[model samples]
Target: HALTGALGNMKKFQSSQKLAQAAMLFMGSKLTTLEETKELTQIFRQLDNNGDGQLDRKELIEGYRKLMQVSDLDSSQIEAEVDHILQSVDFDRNGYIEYSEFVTVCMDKQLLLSRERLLAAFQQFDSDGSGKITNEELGRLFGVTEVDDETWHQVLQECDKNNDGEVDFEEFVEMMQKICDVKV
Candidate 1:
């Protein structure tokens, strides 16, 4: 199922950020379905044509097609849309399955929450000497191979309530609270 699911898999997590991916990556070590571990491991390297530790547009499209098993994507409308999707995801930052490549875990942390824990998470997201992290900024850390542009924008609309298009520490906490379900 290399091409069987990787194509869909590639498009799925393209919307997540480093927090989920990085968390899931370590989580992979803790507990993971042997199926996922094996599949993810092979898929990441298999698609990374350049072996540069990052997958770019050319590699992604080709990889996607490679996974498609059809081998008929050049100069087609689907090809164009795929390119468009990649560029849309690239408007602010970058994506090439940097950390979201194989870290598919989204569940962990046994309910008990800690201040320092959340703070440290936000600290990572709020680097670069900024008080708050902007949608653009979060996109930078995302570093996934492919993401739908409209995806995070919708998230921004929910978390970024101030209309400044930024998520302050408080806002980030709330969002994570909802996403992480961290109970104080």
Candidate 2:
């Protein structure tokens, strides 16, 4: 009966091999319930440091420092790596990374996990679905009363690798990758 319930739920995510793999990994014999995820949440909480329910860049850097077992407070390389990780997951452009952002890091190997979430964000930013995002659209999404044409232009220039003058889904994904590219 339990196996029946498990397989029944598994059928819902069979469409994506990645989702299936994640499910198989997280739902394996070692963890049959939410217990393992809860442990992750606890670890996040402990690493959060300031108890602000989100991790700032400093906290993230400190965590990396502890992981590397190096007490050198002057490690620019570690700081840059953590900054890159934050850039990929902090979609809202906020200085801090929330739990959901952390979850993405945990779930995907290339970083920026949950294609569904990324698609949703793209949809929200792309409002009219013209296959590209304009400065005005981004301004509206960010709730800015006045669009800063120059700032938005620079953002598009940086994120739009194709030089198309606007951000497309592909470019946006590239931007996300730029945030968390795996380095050897």
Candidate 3:
């Protein structure tokens, strides 16, 4: 639940690279670059706040707080939510939610996965090299064809804060956060 949009993208990208590397090791093709390694490190640091070298409950809470805040949700509600999350993972009667346990829970939340997918999907929709996407492209991404003509124009007008008839990267990210129920 705490995975930021960038971090989620990294996780997906890294996983894909790892799988490709594993499959082509004998062919001597390197799938991941130095930049990617640095990106992974940065992502790890984002998760391991306080520079503690590892993630703990507070770190997890803070990360989740960030994600929720991005979606415009209250972070305090995480108290109850985290309790339930930990309880659900404490199947072996463990007192704490371990890294593996927390990750397992996060994967089930759908936010991390969907955010990553949405980022990639946006890249695909921005086909004109214009650094922006149109509402029609967005509808295509959601597989919602034959979008109501009135609703289409209305949404375009509503979201196009700059009145550009298209959404740039930041605007696109904000819309995705809204759709994903994020607060910050």
lDDT of each: 0.53, 0.53, 0.46
- 7-80: candidate 2 lDDT, tens digit per residue: 12222222212211222232231222335346446666766898877888888777766655653555886676
Q: Give TM per candidate.
A: 0.44, 0.47, 0.33
Q: How accurate is candidate 2 locally (lDDT)?
A: 0.53
Better of 2 and 3 by lDDT: 2
**Per-residue lDDT of model 1, residues 128-169, tens digit only:** 758887555556665643345575565565567787766687
lDDT of 3 by residue, 48-114 (tens): 7666444555765676676756333555555545555444443333555443333322332233324
Alpha-carbon deviation at 140 in model 2, angstroms = 2.2
**Pick by lDDT: 1 or 3, better one:** 1
Residue 78's lDDT in candidate 1 = 47
Candidate order, lDDT descending: 2, 1, 3
lDDT of 3 at 57: 55
Which portions of model 2 miss their true places by more than 4 Å? Answer: 1-39, 48-111, 145-147, 182-184
